[model samples]
Target chain A: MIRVYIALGSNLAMPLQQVSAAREALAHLPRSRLVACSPLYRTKPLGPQDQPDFLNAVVALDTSLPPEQLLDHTQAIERNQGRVRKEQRWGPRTLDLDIMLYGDQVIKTDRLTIPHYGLKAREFMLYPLADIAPDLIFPDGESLSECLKRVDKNGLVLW
Target chain B: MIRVYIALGSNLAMPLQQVSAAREALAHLPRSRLVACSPLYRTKPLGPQDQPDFLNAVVALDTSLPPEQLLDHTQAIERNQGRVRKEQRWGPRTLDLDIMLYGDQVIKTDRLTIPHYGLKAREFMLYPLADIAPDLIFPDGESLSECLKRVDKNGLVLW
Candidate 1:
């Protein structure tokens, strides 16, 4: 089974409840078992500041499903939880689930990007990720600890 | 030197001229040399039909600079050519330059995604890429020829 890390965030519709429900959904996905979950964090939104602050966390899983299938399931979870595909790139959402790491694999497909597009620089993703996998080394040989050193908390706080 | 492929596209402000000017700019980036360029293709826009059709092509480069530096140069080229950072994800632009492949390496960073997010399925990207590097094999072991077999032309025509 491949080990995968998923980042979850919500800024609307009872953000905490939305994230909790999504975590429950992830735990029940076929061929996957949730192994670890980080403490929830409250972070300032990355882009536009007009939106509400986000509730974020990271969850690790061991899964036999392919990357694309996992992506499909995550997207479905987003949709089912009242997330809408918006024209604004960084608009507020009900739930945002991103596949951060898939066992050190680097994947760039039409529909999915593993290690996620924002994994390296986003404090919300990096700090929560470090909570559960402090010794993690990326495919590029950068350690999770090294990444943490380069990024400030940026107003991220524990829930 | 890492052999890289860059995909260029424009759908506004005389797209043909914009692409040509961007190619010239790429040819002059420090520590890089343009090796091959494909014929330009006119493709219907992938999303939002209100926009004009796009003129697209791929160019191969041999570069010694790090990926982030190349990305900075590309973004500079886009900004200089009047490309605006838009809220709409797939809106028309004056120029769109994407790094499709950085040798056989897989890269995912905050500012760049090598082998590009759309390389595998977008006909405008794949067909033009095949024209310049028919034998190219990705880090995932999929050949350019194999990718071409899976994607249809999707109304792409010679410019």
Candidate 2:
């Protein structure tokens, strides 16, 4: 089974509740076992500042599903949780589920990019990711701790 | 400047001589310095057994060029060395230079994929990569040593 890390975030319609619900949904994913969940963090929005702060976390899963199939499941979870694709890239959302890492896989396709595009630079994602997989190593050979050292917390606070 | 690891391989037209020439070419790339080069390894080919063994090595570079621009330079090196992209994948080549890692960057585009696609799984690449960047960690948080532990030597011998 591949050990995959999923990043979760929400900033609309009771974000805390939305993220919590999504976490539960992940636990029930077919052929997947939720192994660990990082502590929730409240972070400032990235793109447009007018929006509310985001509730974010990361989850680890051991799964038999292929990466694309897992993407289908995560996108379905987002849609089910009332997430609507917005015109703005980083706008507030009901729930945001991103496949951060799929085992040690480096994947890029029209629909998905693993080790999520923003994994390294985003404090919200890296901090929570480090909480669960402190010893994690990227496919390119960079450590989670190494990345954490370079990025600031950016006012990220634990919930 | 971003630190990049480039993988070099050759099995046609005096593999050893071809790799050595390519190494020198890398040293001369504009705005780039060849920091280190791993000892060459002669390994059994991956695909058809009809082909001869390959001479493989990894080189470290500190480059000021963007990933795509660097790619342009590497592809130019390959072509100048008489590397012709054949109909068959993994066919014998005059020279094959791949951008294995570009700092902590995770890049995937039509032309290039950082943390090269075959990095973790291929012993020829991983073993030589481990030689120079022993303490390397991937952008996704996996260490070179950790990956080295899982892959077998697979009859790879020093050239």
Candidate 3:
């Protein structure tokens, strides 16, 4: 089984409930089991001030599905929750799911990147991500907890 | 009214519960009202690994009590909750209370120091202190959030 880490976030339309439901759907993924999850975090809007605060959490899962297949399953889950990709970056969304890491493998494709590039700078991502997997070592050679120290953790808080 | 920020922490029996009870006790301080509080955080033990991890939080208050008197009151509260200061500098305890900032004043005495000297290096203290008061400017002219970025944040997690 491949241990994968994913970030779940929502801001518009009862974000807390939306993220919670997404977590529930993830548990039903075929050949997968939810191993651990961090507590919910409330964060300042990431990109645009036109949206509301986002609720973010990170989950750890062990799955037999391949990376591409797992991505498909995760995207399908988002679609089921009414997430529609708009042209604007970081716009408000009903639900959003992003693959943050797939084991220790680094993959670069037009559609996906393992060890998500934004992992270094965003406190909303690092805090919860590190909560469940404190010893996680990144491609950059620092552990998750180490990387978290260098990030700007200004507006992150437990929900 | 004088504004004050206090650091609360525990690592002994029922640590989280002890910290929660300390918050309640803060509300009962004479001529003071609890103004704001950050969420609880679980942090790595600072001085030694033999001890258990600590639960930490920061609270803001508006108090009419003088700084020395306020210190006495807080020490009393800590003792009531079973805090005993052993010879060990960073020994484990049932409850630990500290005067982080007593308004904007900077005073240094053998017994106390306003704007605790440890504030800058302690992520456990900076994170929660910044959570509720992001824009709080320290006596050194940097905001709490600014000081947070410069601190080592490794192994800190939301509780």
Candidate 4:
């Protein structure tokens, strides 16, 4: 099985417990096994700062599913947690599940990217991701610890 | 066998060719097999800017040598390349080979420190290391990619 890492975030509906609850449900992702989960991190809203802050973190898992299958499962988890994708572009949401890395495979289909867009520059993803997989290398040859160098991590706090 | 990641750098006497020659000799490291090598990267001097820019890169290997024996071989490589570790910390050099990581081991003795001292803060080491062992987790539970977050990479270039 290949290793995949996922980023999880939330800022709605009792987000602290919302994400905690999501953590519990992550184990059912088809043929995958949850290997590790980072501690919860709280941060200022990434976009539209007028909204409540977000709780962000990462999870590492071993999966037999293809990237798309993993995406389907994560989105399914997001939907089950009340996420609704809108054209809001960083609008506050009930849940956000993003595919951070799919083993050493680099993929760029219209619907998905292995490293995810904007992963290296965001403290929300970098901090917690480093917490779990600090040595993680992106499919595109960037190191998570190296990527962490470019992000501003002022407000990331353990929740 | 233990996995060892080595950082190679040069800033004197045709560095590009100097590093290239080293890469050829690296394959002959006693009791070791070169597994992978990172693309060569050019980085500004980490110690002082007065010197010429340094050409840097990394190599991943599986070796049977313990830390001390490995040191002897790498130093021999440097000596053959005309390296002289002088009083000047950032003095330009013909070659330098550092043991960045030795398996998942953490060693601390006067002679050597596994994971290398100040690894997290030096882009020269972090950038190239992440290139080869992006998934390398440190003995401290930090990922190499994760440590990349805190280093300065103002003048690093892929050459």
Best by DockQ: 1
Could you give the DockQ of candidate 1?
0.24
State the fnat of candidate 4 relative to the true structure.
0.00
What TM-score describes the B chain of model 1? 0.92
Best of the two (1, 4) by lDDT = 1
Candidate 3: how large is its RMSD? 20.3
Interface RMSD of 3: 24.9
TM-score of each: 0.59, 0.50, 0.48, 0.47
On DockQ, who's better, 2 or 4?
A: 2
Candidate 2 TM-score versus the reference: 0.50
After superposition, which runs of candidate 3 have C-alpha atoms over 4 Å from their true positions? A1-159, B83-91
Best by lDDT: 1
Candidate 4 chain B weakest lDDT stretch, 10 residues: B83-92
B4-123: candidate 4 lDDT, tens digit per residue: 888898887468877888888888888899899898887777431267888889898999998888887887777666623321222457778889889888865424656666566678
Which tens-of-lDDT digit does each residue in B1-159 have in candidate 1? 889899898887478888999999999999999998999999887531367888999999999988888887887787676624443333457787899889888887556667787788899999988887888888999888987889999899999
Q: Which segments of model 4 are wrong by more than 4 Å?
A: A1-159, B83-91
Each candidate's number of clashing pairs is 0, 11, 0, 13
Q: For model 4, what is the error of residue A72's alpha carbon versus the real structure, in angstroms, after optimal superposition?
A: 56
Error of 3 at B60 (Å): 0.7
State the lDDT of candidate 1 residue by residue for A1-159, as single tens digits.
Answer: 999999998887368888999999999999999999999999887531367888999999999999888987887787677524443333457787999999989987666767787788889999999999999999889999999999889899997
Over A1-159, each residue of candidate 4 has an lDDT whose tens digit, in order, gives 988878888886478866777777777777889899998888877421278778888988899998767777777677566623321222356777888778887775424655665566678877888888878777767787887777778688887
Summarize candidate 2's per-residue lDDT along A1-159 as a digit string, tens digits: 999999998887468878888989999999999999999998887531378888999999999999878988887787666523321222356787989899999886435667786788888889999988899899999999998898899899996
